[PDB]
Amino acid sequence: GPAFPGMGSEELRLASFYDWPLTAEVPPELLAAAGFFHTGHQDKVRCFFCYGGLQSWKRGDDPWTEHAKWFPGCQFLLRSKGQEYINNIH
């Protein structure tokens, strides 16, 4: 199951970005959709399912792409985006 089942709701994940410092650069909507919630006040996020943590976001980074790049074994990623998507990023 998920590492953090309490953050399984996309809407709850989205709410966590109320204090996101990079709104124009990396949209909260895309982050939440990609399984990520905001951890702290800076630019750190974690996936609710695999608990993979990402920081140092650059402008235009794509949350799904980053999810697949760094945590290709995540089952939420697989279920959401499929194996072909993951393979093509790798």
Ligand SMILES: [Zn+2]
């Ligand atoms: Zn994940």
